[PDB]
mmCIF file of C-alpha atoms in Angstrom:
data_model
loop_
_atom_site.group_PDB
_atom_site.id
_atom_site.type_symbol
_atom_site.label_atom_id
_atom_site.label_comp_id
_atom_site.label_asym_id
_atom_site.label_seq_id
_atom_site.Cartn_x
_atom_site.Cartn_y
_atom_site.Cartn_z
ATOM 1 C CA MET D 1 113.700 108.589 120.513
ATOM 2 C CA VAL D 2 111.262 111.245 118.499
ATOM 3 C CA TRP D 3 108.368 109.698 117.080
ATOM 4 C CA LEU D 4 108.007 110.839 113.216
ATOM 5 C CA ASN D 5 104.743 109.299 111.388
ATOM 6 C CA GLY D 6 104.545 106.732 113.664
ATOM 7 C CA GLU D 7 108.244 105.594 113.384
ATOM 8 C CA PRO D 8 111.208 105.992 116.291
ATOM 9 C CA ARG D 9 113.738 108.591 114.666
ATOM 10 C CA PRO D 10 117.105 109.847 116.479
ATOM 11 C CA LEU D 11 115.577 113.667 115.759
ATOM 12 C CA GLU D 12 116.303 115.106 119.511
ATOM 13 C CA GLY D 13 117.794 118.299 118.947
ATOM 14 C CA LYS D 14 116.879 119.377 115.533
ATOM 15 C CA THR D 15 114.210 121.752 114.434
ATOM 16 C CA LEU D 16 111.120 120.721 112.670
ATOM 17 C CA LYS D 17 112.265 122.929 109.799
ATOM 18 C CA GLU D 18 115.798 120.750 109.530
ATOM 19 C CA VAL D 19 113.340 117.735 109.606
ATOM 20 C CA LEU D 20 111.114 118.686 106.724
ATOM 21 C CA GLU D 21 114.029 119.721 104.646
ATOM 22 C CA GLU D 22 115.610 116.207 105.193
ATOM 23 C CA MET D 23 112.342 114.916 104.174
ATOM 24 C CA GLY D 24 112.082 116.532 101.160
ATOM 25 C CA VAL D 25 108.831 117.897 102.255
ATOM 26 C CA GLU D 26 106.767 120.727 100.221
ATOM 27 C CA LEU D 27 106.393 123.377 103.309
ATOM 28 C CA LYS D 28 103.434 124.826 101.718
ATOM 29 C CA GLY D 29 101.760 121.501 100.903
ATOM 30 C CA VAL D 30 101.858 120.162 104.544
ATOM 31 C CA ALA D 31 100.410 120.916 108.146
ATOM 32 C CA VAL D 32 102.590 119.312 110.898
ATOM 33 C CA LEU D 33 101.658 117.973 114.299
ATOM 34 C CA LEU D 34 103.753 118.438 117.070
ATOM 35 C CA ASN D 35 102.264 116.864 120.087
ATOM 36 C CA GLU D 36 98.843 118.481 120.954
ATOM 37 C CA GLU D 37 99.524 121.408 118.371
ATOM 38 C CA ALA D 38 99.100 121.841 114.728
ATOM 39 C CA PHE D 39 101.310 123.967 112.343
ATOM 40 C CA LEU D 40 101.030 124.736 108.639
ATOM 41 C CA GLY D 41 104.481 123.813 107.169
ATOM 42 C CA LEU D 42 105.636 127.254 106.526
ATOM 43 C CA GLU D 43 104.691 128.426 110.425
ATOM 44 C CA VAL D 44 106.434 125.191 112.444
ATOM 45 C CA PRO D 45 108.061 126.541 115.534
ATOM 46 C CA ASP D 46 111.414 126.795 116.125
ATOM 47 C CA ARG D 47 111.751 124.573 119.472
ATOM 48 C CA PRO D 48 114.498 122.113 119.107
ATOM 49 C CA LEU D 49 112.565 118.420 119.280
ATOM 50 C CA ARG D 50 112.708 116.804 122.302
ATOM 51 C CA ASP D 51 112.898 113.008 123.313
ATOM 52 C CA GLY D 52 109.361 111.630 123.578
ATOM 53 C CA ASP D 53 107.986 114.077 121.089
ATOM 54 C CA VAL D 54 105.290 113.121 118.369
ATOM 55 C CA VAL D 55 105.511 114.298 115.154
ATOM 56 C CA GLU D 56 103.313 113.641 112.179
ATOM 57 C CA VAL D 57 103.592 115.343 108.687
ATOM 58 C CA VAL D 58 100.219 115.358 106.877
ATOM 59 C CA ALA D 59 99.598 116.280 103.268
ATOM 60 C CA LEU D 60 97.129 118.796 102.592
ATOM 61 C CA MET D 61 94.463 117.577 100.118
ATOM 62 C CA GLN D 62 91.574 118.776 98.200
ATOM 63 C CA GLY D 63 88.234 117.562 99.640
ATOM 64 C CA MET P 1 101.715 94.923 99.711
ATOM 65 C CA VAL P 2 104.043 97.586 98.710
ATOM 66 C CA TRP P 3 107.333 98.688 100.425
ATOM 67 C CA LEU P 4 107.823 102.109 101.156
ATOM 68 C CA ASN P 5 111.137 103.089 102.675
ATOM 69 C CA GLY P 6 111.164 99.952 104.270
ATOM 70 C CA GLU P 7 107.486 100.061 105.398
ATOM 71 C CA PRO P 8 104.638 97.926 104.555
ATOM 72 C CA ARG P 9 101.697 99.718 102.766
ATOM 73 C CA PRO P 10 98.814 99.125 100.700
ATOM 74 C CA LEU P 11 99.342 101.005 97.660
ATOM 75 C CA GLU P 12 98.421 98.862 95.004
ATOM 76 C CA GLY P 13 96.814 100.580 92.224
ATOM 77 C CA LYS P 14 98.407 104.094 93.143
ATOM 78 C CA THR P 15 101.009 105.852 90.771
ATOM 79 C CA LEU P 16 104.122 106.958 92.161
ATOM 80 C CA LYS P 17 103.085 110.285 91.305
ATOM 81 C CA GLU P 18 99.868 109.762 93.493
ATOM 82 C CA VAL P 19 102.058 108.536 96.593
ATOM 83 C CA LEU P 20 104.469 111.403 96.253
ATOM 84 C CA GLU P 21 101.604 113.705 96.289
ATOM 85 C CA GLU P 22 100.323 111.920 99.480
ATOM 86 C CA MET P 23 103.653 112.334 101.222
ATOM 87 C CA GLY P 24 103.491 116.153 100.397
ATOM 88 C CA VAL P 25 106.743 116.007 98.974
ATOM 89 C CA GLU P 26 108.764 118.183 96.379
ATOM 90 C CA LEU P 27 109.014 116.363 93.164
ATOM 91 C CA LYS P 28 112.031 118.005 92.409
ATOM 92 C CA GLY P 29 113.281 117.517 95.869
ATOM 93 C CA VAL P 30 113.526 114.035 95.694
ATOM 94 C CA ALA P 31 114.786 111.255 93.834
ATOM 95 C CA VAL P 32 112.850 107.565 93.739
ATOM 96 C CA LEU P 33 114.018 104.124 93.601
ATOM 97 C CA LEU P 34 111.459 101.627 92.109
ATOM 98 C CA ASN P 35 113.059 98.356 92.332
ATOM 99 C CA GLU P 36 116.665 99.354 92.678
ATOM 100 C CA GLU P 37 115.785 101.592 89.649
ATOM 101 C CA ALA P 38 116.339 105.235 90.431
ATOM 102 C CA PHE P 39 114.247 108.451 89.271
ATOM 103 C CA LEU P 40 113.748 112.182 89.514
ATOM 104 C CA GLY P 41 110.764 113.071 91.226
ATOM 105 C CA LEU P 42 109.231 114.521 87.949
ATOM 106 C CA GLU P 43 110.524 111.436 85.837
ATOM 107 C CA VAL P 44 108.878 108.546 87.648
ATOM 108 C CA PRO P 45 107.076 105.805 85.489
ATOM 109 C CA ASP P 46 103.215 106.100 85.732
ATOM 110 C CA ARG P 47 102.454 102.346 86.048
ATOM 111 C CA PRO P 48 100.218 101.359 88.989
ATOM 112 C CA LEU P 49 101.885 100.116 91.796
ATOM 113 C CA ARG P 50 101.586 96.400 92.386
ATOM 114 C CA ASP P 51 102.231 93.881 95.197
ATOM 115 C CA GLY P 52 105.626 93.451 96.048
ATOM 116 C CA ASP P 53 107.064 96.618 94.548
ATOM 117 C CA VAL P 54 109.892 98.123 96.881
ATOM 118 C CA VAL P 55 109.917 101.892 96.892
ATOM 119 C CA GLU P 56 112.548 104.258 98.384
ATOM 120 C CA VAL P 57 112.207 107.706 98.547
ATOM 121 C CA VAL P 58 115.269 110.010 99.316
ATOM 122 C CA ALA P 59 115.398 114.046 99.603
ATOM 123 C CA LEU P 60 118.615 115.130 97.554
ATOM 124 C CA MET P 61 120.866 117.192 99.807
ATOM 125 C CA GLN P 62 123.210 119.616 99.225
ATOM 126 C CA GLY P 63 126.913 118.073 99.517
ATOM 127 C CA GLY P 64 129.220 121.136 99.987
#
């Protein structure tokens, strides 16, 4: 399974963009953690998700 | 405790607005189910969430 925000989800094979769209996420308003990496929502990589991947989608707030 | 998409979270006091913004979702891109009652993202109630509330947030897809 792929871990999304702390929950196991059958996401293997899907790209982050595909996943974010299925979440109804505003790309410009979030950052995405893929394992030991971070991306702005608009600049996530196209590498298909793999088993064991850990993904965290975080909303960018104003301090 | 408030159930959000099946998961328990301490969102009491927060409005749905606020929760959606903390989720970083597109208001226009989702539908929200407050206790089995459905709202378009932009037209969610403004009352603060309370213990026992069941919330479901679903992205609106294009079928076709």
